Structure 1
């Protein structure tokens, strides 16, 4: 006989779809219909799943929109190279397809590059940006985390890199768990694996690290990233920066610097964390975003 009697693993959000440049994109859409929407953008190799435990904190007061990038999550998977340029084109068109006007961004990893680049080009529409573990220029390999130098150098080759990421699914099975301090459960791993069970679908997982602005290459990405970082230092847009210890892309020392150099910026320590801060302390991140959103309406 039986009797009846943690960081959430479920994804209790109804699928929403919109046609974007002839392809179907999936997104979470919850919360009130009026007011300024909060747009959550994930990076590599995740999906809207990464926001699952953060969104419920914001949804009571704001619309939350969390798309899966083209070729990822539940969005369609056209035969693209999935360059950053492709993601930009699709994300621009997604935002237009939903008829969004002003927005608040919550962005992470490659999602931050998309968010920052979009904000730079749409200064009058951005009402706030929350960000963490974001893409910035990496002048030399010495400025890349030591533990991942050899690995990412290998990733950034055609034959070896594709064998690792596409054939062996290393970014999902290897790199992903290394971006979280706590161990991911099998249920969580399965939600992350889901979009990429078919090896040929793993193209964006390989192109993304090959797009990273490292040692001047790719030059186009480096220029673009420098441009939005320059814009960011000059914009009065409200900013909220989450960081963890030791972090990965944004070490604590770097978070302290940005908190001062970026105008109108608040920085929040999430405790232990690497790249996927959302997976180590989603309640703090969600709570702080919800409260920060409230202060955006306070004049002073």
Structure 2
């Protein structure tokens, strides 16, 4: 899998690219602990209608592994730098997990950029631990990730995000090749640090406060925004249940909900054709209706 690379902020970032270069930009944003690989069966279905770019976040996939904190704001800075390097000033965003937090934060700061947002399994500030996920076992696992020393043993030493959380929220069983690809960036203990930092960034009960502020503001900007929105949901889902998707959608302008059926968090692995076909049709409709 040969990706494109660019130098960004003294390190490097990798990205997949496909589609016609005169079509609108479509930026695909993955989360923890995946990469642009998550979109491999989706992007080819959007290529006829969009110039598709799928970055590997810093510390993920084939991107660089600099000595940084890997906090949310680090991810935002490196993504901004790549967007500017690639000349992306107007784009559709297609986002998952921390990719949605990045998309919401980007749209709040650059309100002219977003032509439309397709999203699923998104992050929002959670008032209490009871607002995170659908079952107690997941809540307890993430409580442990956020516990000093314990989280390091689970994620740095045992690679639990890659080896347990990821396959645990895909309905089908990945092939040996697919799981080998997902674990390949994370062969060393130190390389796993980004995957430990992100669960510690989740905004739960106001902590961390800086992420809580950024995503509270970003969600308010999202509620006020007028660009088209497409929210995919699975059953039972993980961060987003079908019931919560329908209720969240009512708080937004111009947001349709697409039901994918049985799925957990990594809906791209269980429903790639449905997501790709939906996004491509949606872009085609927006482009035609906005071109008059």
Q: Same fold (TM over 0.5)?
A: yes
Distance 1:281 1:297 in 2: 24
Query: Which of residues 70, 90, 99 is equivalent to 2:78?
Result: 90
Q: What SS does the corresponding residue of 1:72 show, helix, strand or coil?
A: coil
Distance 2:76 2:119 in 1: 18
Aligned Cα root-mean-square deviation (Å): 1.1
The answer on whether the counterparts of 2:23 and 2:49 sit within 8 Å (CA) in structure 1 is no
Distance 2:69 2:10 in 1: 17
Aligned length: 288
Name the counterpart of 1:7: none
Q: Does 1:132 align with 2:88?
A: no
Q: Does 1:151 align with 2:141?
A: yes
- 1:149: Cα distance to partner? 1.2
Name the counterpart of 1:217: 207
Query: Which of residues 237, 241, 254 is equivalent to 1:264?
Result: 254
* Consecutive unaligned residues in structure 1, runs of 5 or more: 1-10
Name the counterpart of 2:43: 55
* Consecutive unaligned residues in structure 2, runs of 5 or more: none
**What is the 5 A alignment of 1:243-282?**
243-282=233-272
- 1:35: Cα distance to partner? 2.9
- 1:54: Cα distance to partner? 0.5
Query: Scaled by the length of structure 1, what TM-score is found?
Result: 0.94
Name the counterpart of 2:189: 199
Q: What SS does the corresponding residue of 2:121 show, helix, strand or coil?
A: strand
Distance 1:41 1:217 in 2: 24
Query: Scaled by the length of structure 2, what TM-score is found?
Result: 0.96
Distance 1:163 1:221 in 2: 24
Q: Which runs of 4+ in 1 moved over 2 A?
A: none
Q: What SS does the corresponding residue of 1:270 show, helix, strand or coil?
A: strand
Q: What SS does the corresponding residue of 1:298 show, helix, strand or coil?
A: helix
- 1:147: Cα distance to partner? 2.5
Q: Does 1:18 align with 2:2?
A: no
**What is the 5 A alignment of 1:220-231?**
220-231=210-221
Q: What SS does the corresponding residue of 1:99 show, helix, strand or coil?
A: coil
